[PDB]
């Protein structure tokens, strides 16, 4: 199994969140992952917004498609991990879901 690692950097531009993914080499990427065997994807939050962002989960418009088997979250909301057993072939799209300390609205990454 492979364990892949992406950093989720969140900045504000024009007062709103911008999500910039970096890979283990420090390169900006799309945070997309191809899974070619059973493995994990670990996302680490680097919140530079001053809005107190914490992960609360990972959201899917097609949550029963079988592409991702499970989501785990750390107690401090700085990490989410995806389990992908890579049995079902195909593609899924997801949005990070975060709380913030400025208001009671949840924050989503781009569709």
């Amino acid at each position: 199994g492979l364990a892949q690692f992406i950093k989720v950097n969140v900045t504000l531009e024009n007062g709103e969140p911008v999500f910039i993914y970096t890979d283990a080499n420090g390169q900006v990427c799309q945070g997309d992952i191809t899974v070619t065997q059973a493995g994990t994807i670990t996302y680490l939050l680097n919140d530079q917004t001053l809005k107190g962002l914490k992960f609360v989960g990972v959201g899917f418009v097609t949550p029963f498609d079988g592409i991702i088997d499970a989501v785990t979250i750390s107690s401090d909301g700085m990490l989410v991990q995806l389990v992908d057993l890579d049995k079902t072939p195909g593609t899924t799209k997801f949005q990070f879901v975060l709380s913030n300390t400025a208001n009671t609205l949840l924050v989503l990454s781009a569709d």
Partner: peptide, 7 residues
């Protein structure tokens, strides 16, 4: 982001 499974 998107995940692509190629099993």
């Amino acid at each position: 982001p998107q995940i692509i499974n190629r099993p």
